[PDB]
Design an enzyme around this catalytic site. Structure first.
Site, PDB file in Angstrom:
ATOM      1  N   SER A   1       0.807  -1.127   0.169  1.00 22.10           N
ATOM      2  CA  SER A   1      -0.064  -0.045   0.146  1.00 22.10           C
ATOM      3  C   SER A   1       0.704   1.334   0.086  1.00 22.10           C
ATOM      4  O   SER A   1       2.344   1.087   0.089  1.00 22.10           O
ATOM      5  CB  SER A   1      -0.874  -0.037   1.328  1.00 22.10           C
ATOM      6  OG  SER A   1      -0.148   0.264   2.520  1.00 22.10           O
TER       7      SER A   1
ATOM      8  N   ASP B   1       6.025  -7.561   2.508  1.00 29.22           N
ATOM      9  CA  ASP B   1       4.907  -6.644   3.154  1.00 29.22           C
ATOM     10  C   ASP B   1       4.161  -7.817   4.101  1.00 29.22           C
ATOM     11  O   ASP B   1       4.273  -9.034   3.952  1.00 29.22           O
ATOM     12  CB  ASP B   1       3.913  -5.966   2.436  1.00 29.22           C
ATOM     13  CG  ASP B   1       3.051  -4.883   2.940  1.00 29.22           C
ATOM     14  OD1 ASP B   1       2.176  -5.349   3.921  1.00 29.22           O
ATOM     15  OD2 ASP B   1       3.177  -3.772   2.559  1.00 29.22           O
TER      16      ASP B   1
ATOM     17  N   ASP C   1       7.667  -9.925   7.796  1.00 26.10           N
ATOM     18  CA  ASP C   1       8.073  -9.069   8.789  1.00 26.10           C
ATOM     19  C   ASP C   1       9.444  -8.343   8.353  1.00 26.10           C
ATOM     20  O   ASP C   1      10.536  -9.399   8.513  1.00 26.10           O
ATOM     21  CB  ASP C   1       7.591  -9.234  10.096  1.00 26.10           C
ATOM     22  CG  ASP C   1       7.895  -8.442  11.195  1.00 26.10           C
ATOM     23  OD1 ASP C   1       8.452  -7.284  11.136  1.00 26.10           O
ATOM     24  OD2 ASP C   1       6.908  -8.436  12.164  1.00 26.10           O
ATOM     25  N   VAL C   2       9.455  -7.187   8.229  1.00 31.69           N
ATOM     26  CA  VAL C   2      10.823  -6.486   7.978  1.00 31.69           C
ATOM     27  C   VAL C   2      11.966  -6.659   9.284  1.00 31.69           C
ATOM     28  O   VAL C   2      13.052  -6.556   9.143  1.00 31.69           O
ATOM     29  CB  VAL C   2      10.919  -5.021   7.786  1.00 31.69           C
ATOM     30  CG1 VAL C   2      10.264  -5.013   6.226  1.00 31.69           C
ATOM     31  CG2 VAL C   2      10.020  -4.316   8.683  1.00 31.69           C
TER      32      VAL C   2
ATOM     33  N   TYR D   1       7.576   8.327  16.852  1.00 33.31           N
ATOM     34  CA  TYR D   1       7.924   8.230  15.399  1.00 33.31           C
ATOM     35  C   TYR D   1       8.860   8.807  14.774  1.00 33.31           C
ATOM     36  O   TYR D   1       9.752   8.470  14.145  1.00 33.31           O
ATOM     37  CB  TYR D   1       6.459   8.645  14.625  1.00 33.31           C
ATOM     38  CG  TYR D   1       6.432   8.564  13.151  1.00 33.31           C
ATOM     39  CD1 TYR D   1       6.319   7.452  12.612  1.00 33.31           C
ATOM     40  CD2 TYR D   1       6.481   9.765  12.580  1.00 33.31           C
ATOM     41  CE1 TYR D   1       6.005   7.238  11.160  1.00 33.31           C
ATOM     42  CE2 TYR D   1       6.450   9.786  11.035  1.00 33.31           C
ATOM     43  CZ  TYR D   1       6.352   8.255  10.248  1.00 33.31           C
ATOM     44  OH  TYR D   1       6.302   8.460   8.958  1.00 33.31           O
TER      45      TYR D   1
ATOM     46  N   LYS E   1      12.212   7.544  12.903  1.00 29.57           N
ATOM     47  CA  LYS E   1      12.934   8.225  11.609  1.00 29.57           C
ATOM     48  C   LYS E   1      14.073   8.887  11.613  1.00 29.57           C
ATOM     49  O   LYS E   1      14.656   9.113  10.539  1.00 29.57           O
ATOM     50  CB  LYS E   1      11.756   9.198  11.118  1.00 29.57           C
ATOM     51  CG  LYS E   1      10.370   8.406  10.798  1.00 29.57           C
ATOM     52  CD  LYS E   1      10.408   7.338   9.819  1.00 29.57           C
ATOM     53  CE  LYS E   1       9.095   6.606   9.621  1.00 29.57           C
ATOM     54  NZ  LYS E   1       9.457   5.659   8.427  1.00 29.57           N
TER      55      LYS E   1
ATOM     56  N   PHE F   1       1.659  12.746   2.876  1.00 23.59           N
ATOM     57  CA  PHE F   1       1.094  12.124   1.590  1.00 23.59           C
ATOM     58  C   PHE F   1      -0.211  11.669   1.859  1.00 23.59           C
ATOM     59  O   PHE F   1      -0.733  11.210   3.068  1.00 23.59           O
ATOM     60  CB  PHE F   1       1.930  11.091   1.325  1.00 23.59           C
ATOM     61  CG  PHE F   1       3.179  11.754   0.356  1.00 23.59           C
ATOM     62  CD1 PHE F   1       4.095  12.541   0.724  1.00 23.59           C
ATOM     63  CD2 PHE F   1       3.225  11.819  -0.888  1.00 23.59           C
ATOM     64  CE1 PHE F   1       5.145  12.929   0.180  1.00 23.59           C
ATOM     65  CE2 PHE F   1       4.290  12.178  -1.578  1.00 23.59           C
ATOM     66  CZ  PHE F   1       5.189  12.806  -1.052  1.00 23.59           C
TER      67      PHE F   1
ATOM     68  N   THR G   1      -1.892   8.614   2.106  1.00 23.75           N
ATOM     69  CA  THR G   1      -1.692   7.206   2.228  1.00 23.75           C
ATOM     70  C   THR G   1      -2.941   6.686   3.592  1.00 23.75           C
ATOM     71  O   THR G   1      -3.312   7.434   4.219  1.00 23.75           O
ATOM     72  CB  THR G   1      -0.299   7.042   3.052  1.00 23.75           C
ATOM     73  OG1 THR G   1      -0.141   7.830   4.111  1.00 23.75           O
ATOM     74  CG2 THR G   1       0.882   7.313   2.099  1.00 23.75           C
TER      75      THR G   1
HETATM   76  N1  LIG Z   1       6.757  -5.190  10.233  1.00 26.34           N
HETATM   77  C1  LIG Z   1       6.634  -4.664   8.844  1.00 26.34           C
HETATM   78  N2  LIG Z   1       7.168  -5.812   7.976  1.00 26.34           N
HETATM   79  C2  LIG Z   1       6.526  -5.640   6.542  1.00 26.34           C
HETATM   80  N3  LIG Z   1       5.608  -4.796   6.175  1.00 26.34           N
HETATM   81  C3  LIG Z   1       5.064  -3.995   7.229  1.00 26.34           C
HETATM   82  C4  LIG Z   1       5.382  -3.870   8.787  1.00 26.34           C
HETATM   83  N4  LIG Z   1       4.721  -3.256   9.258  1.00 26.34           N
HETATM   84  C5  LIG Z   1       3.903  -2.515   8.457  1.00 26.34           C
HETATM   85  N5  LIG Z   1       4.231  -2.794   7.180  1.00 26.34           N
HETATM   86  C6  LIG Z   1       3.476  -2.345   5.851  1.00 26.34           C
HETATM   87  O1  LIG Z   1       3.874  -0.991   5.734  1.00 26.34           O
HETATM   88  C7  LIG Z   1       2.978  -0.806   4.497  1.00 26.34           C
HETATM   89  C8  LIG Z   1       2.957   0.863   5.085  1.00 26.34           C
HETATM   90  O2  LIG Z   1       4.190   1.375   5.095  1.00 26.34           O
HETATM   91  C9  LIG Z   1       1.919  -1.327   4.819  1.00 26.34           C
HETATM   92  O3  LIG Z   1       1.468  -2.061   3.677  1.00 26.34           O
HETATM   93  C10 LIG Z   1       1.944  -2.482   6.012  1.00 26.34           C
HETATM   94  O4  LIG Z   1       1.252  -3.611   5.745  1.00 26.34           O
END
Ligand SMILES: Nc1ncnc2c1ncn2[C@@H]1O[C@H](CO)[C@@H](O)[C@H]1O
Ligand SMILES: Nc1ncnc2c1ncn2[C@@H]1O[C@H](CO)[C@@H](O)[C@H]1O
Ligand SMILES: Nc1ncnc2c1ncn2[C@@H]1O[C@H](CO)[C@@H](O)[C@H]1O
Ligand SMILES: Nc1ncnc2c1ncn2[C@@H]1O[C@H](CO)[C@@H](O)[C@H]1O
Lengths: 241, 238, 241, 238
Positions: free
Chosen positions: D12, D33, D47-48, D148, D152, D181, D183
């Site tokens: 998204s 994502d 998950d990142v 936040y 950042k 933005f 979003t």
């Molecule tokens: N920990 C995470 N790992 C991967 N994607 C994520 C994480 N947290 C939020 N997002 C994604 O980030 C996008 C918004 O930046 C969204 O589509 C959301 O699902």
């Protein structure tokens, strides 16, 4: 008349600030993993643990109303993004963020909440919170990604914190030290320590802990210093190496 | 040993406060300003943009004792839009602001530094300290403050290259960027600005600026930096 | 469809921007002390003279509505504050400020006034003014006091200008180049040129004029870029020497 | 030759726009994502902050072609005051924001960089380009945006030391700091913020963020810098 809480007060910058505050008349409480032998009140604990910070804050309040809070606890790390066996470890990065950034936020939120009902002084101040970042937040060197990131977070926290706490009469200022005898320097070998010190224009030497303490005390005495990051670095701008 | 100090813009506001504080600290103070005043200070009437006047003031200070502290607080303000009702912002008004605020500061810096270059170093290895005055306008200039902001941004940028070179001579260069202070400098605009300062929610006192200047003089590690003294103010467009 | 005015278009960065704008379809007018042989309209003049800038602006408007203005005219100087015979000359300092800062302000005020009644495009834009500073505005080296001061003024002008011109649909953005083939580099000897280039992390070389032009064209095409200073420097952070 | 790209947060908003733009540019795009979506892209759900998930996404990209472009756009927001009605800002909420926004970005950066370290350099000597996403909150955090902003600010500070080291491997690191933005991320607050943007006086379009990302990829000289994409916005306290 007033109490002060100094995290990282067992040594280096925190120690100097604690001693200077004591000499100034503050009832000083030190929060550090270690205790030492100065004429200070030592609370042994971890800034990343809310229970430990809460214990230290309460200890200070038992002495007198808490006015000065100095976050000087921190850790350093020298680790490349691309190592010889693999990439920078994730846990080492997390640890640096936990102590330097989360720890600073933990101290700020807990001290501020505890000081919120303090009777204001003649300037309308209930207290002042001084955090410690590093010039690495601005010119991070090779191998300082984790450290720089953690300190950059502290830098960015300054304004939103000061903006909100302004309503409560609590100032938030950040000191960004250059090269001093801190975990940053301590984690490097002689060869490196020498070359880094050689980059400082003037004074051409490591900063003295007392110089950091002097700035902290001036911040406490100057109501107009707020929401700012003050570089204390002898004009140093760290090169890549 | 007693040392002398030179404070430009010392007839009023910030400069006056710095001059008085330095005098109380034990410095033999000389003020350079378009006009003299009635404080217990030595006054040299002149223009910071004129080599002859700055040299006269520097010499007058050295007459008292070796010059050590220099504070550039002389300046002019201006509120003028880039696009006015009849035409664009005047070029001469812009030039004047640059001349006084930026060139004047550089003129004082170069002449004072030259005069102190052979002073015997103090215990901290210092031959002198030059403190310039910018403004938060250098970072968040409001509508109508283009000329002022530009002049102060120049002062900000001058700090590091000057400190880097003068480091070899034991001369520090630091810049103070004041926010809103109670200085002789429309009620509508002043009210809007005042309401933007988080804490303290008031105009800064000249004495608070002077206090910071004195601490810079006493702290060897403050060098090549710009220190914002603004109560956390971040000026909005209006 | 639209005209563009590029100061300093006879060479280096300005030249590249002018050629890129021409290729993009703009009717390009160059204002420079010199004229050259490209397929561009050359107006010979000095950016510090309002009559010359006014002549160039009008020339552009005769071709088509003026939309893009790029200030790339400038001069460099390598002079120490403390010389061998005496202090840095006052006139040399004034000259650098006059060309780099006053010249940029002169172009901005005159172009903006002339573009104020332009019919807005689909984005509500009447035009875009792109100024050129330098990384020296942030990390000025020894001997660059005059140059750094002039570029710092350009940097600080960006926001107050963008804030006001926003009401007229005119954007103001500043590009801060690192090491390129410009007056800054041209005023230095080989030995110096080599050591400076060696400080650039990546690309480890002097920037190409076309890379500056590419950024300028992107700024023109991206409505959200406004009141910002964009560093185009290969991650360079100039050391004292 | 065709190259692959990895875009986190691509389901998204900003990440999605970047992923779609890269695909149109000719890249073999893989999105990482929490959830997959329905665009013509390759999706890896994960998950990142998890090494295993990022490695899976990196490997999936290399399956298509050598990895070149990496865009970290995954993130979470939070509006929480330091001093609430019943107590201080929670510690876990702060930690979560830091974990996803900062540690997640670092996790993606370290693993992607390692994966590209042996790519044959392109004509510009590049083995890859990593573009991170911060926010103007890193510079002018509003009341309630401490967590936040801190996360950042960490992303901003990471840029230079990462670029400095990776320069030796021909890998660039640049950060985009978006303003307001449109979003998926109170009407009262949103209105106050929108009214603060000078020009364009509207919410930014995800496509405009994507356009800047693509130009960073095409301009070798953009490196170790943070580019504000905010319509000249400077967020006030409220
Ligand atoms: N920990 C995470 N790992 C991967 N994607 C994520 C994480 N947290 C939020 N997002 C994604 O980030 C996008 C918004 O930046 C969204 O589509 C959301 O699902
Ligand atoms: N997690 C922690 N909690 C409290 N003090 C700490 C922590 N990590 C390091 N310190 C202290 O920080 C000081 C250095 O900043 C040292 O005295 C050290 O013991
Ligand atoms: N060109 C100048 N030279 C010296 N002092 C000046 C100049 N312009 C303004 N001042 C002084 O600056 C002080 C305000 O900063 C005032 O007292 C004023 O007289
Ligand atoms: N005062 C000036 N007016 C117009 N162009 C100038 C001026 N000074 C330098 N230039 C030009 O700037 C370009 C370099 O920026 C050169 O082509 C040079 O001729």
């Amino acid at each position: 008349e007033r109490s002060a809480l100094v995290t990282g007060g067992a040594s280096g910058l925190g120690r100097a600030a604690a001693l200077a505050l004591k000499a100034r008349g503050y009832r000083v409480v030190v929060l550090d993993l270690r205790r030492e032998g100065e004429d200070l009140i030592y609370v042994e604990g971890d800034v990343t643990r809310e229970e430990d910070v809460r214990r230290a804050v309460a200890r200070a309040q038992e002495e007198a109303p808490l006015f000065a809070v100095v976050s000087a606890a921190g850790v350093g790390l020298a680790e490349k993004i691309l190592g010889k066996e693999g990439p920078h470890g994730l846990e080492s990065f997390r640890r640096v963020l936990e102590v330097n950034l989360l720890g600073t936020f933990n101290v700020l939120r807990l001290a501020a909440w505890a000081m919120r009902e303090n009777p204001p002084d003649a300037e309308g101040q209930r207290g002042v919170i001084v955090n410690t970042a590093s010039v690495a937040a601005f010119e991070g060197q090779i191998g300082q990604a984790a450290y720089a990131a953690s300190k950059g977070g502290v830098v960015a926290l300054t304004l939103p914190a000061a903006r909100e706490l302004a309503g409560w009469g609590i100032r938030v200022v950040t000191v960004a030290p250059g090269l001093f005898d801190t975990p940053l320097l301590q984690g490097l070998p002689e060869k490196a320590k020498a070359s880094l010190a050689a980059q400082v224009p003037f004074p051409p030497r490591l900063g003295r802990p007392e110089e950091y303490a002097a700035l902290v005390l001036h911040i406490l005495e100057n109501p107009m210093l707020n929401g700012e990051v003050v570089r204390l670095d002898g004009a140093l701008r760290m090169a890549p190496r």
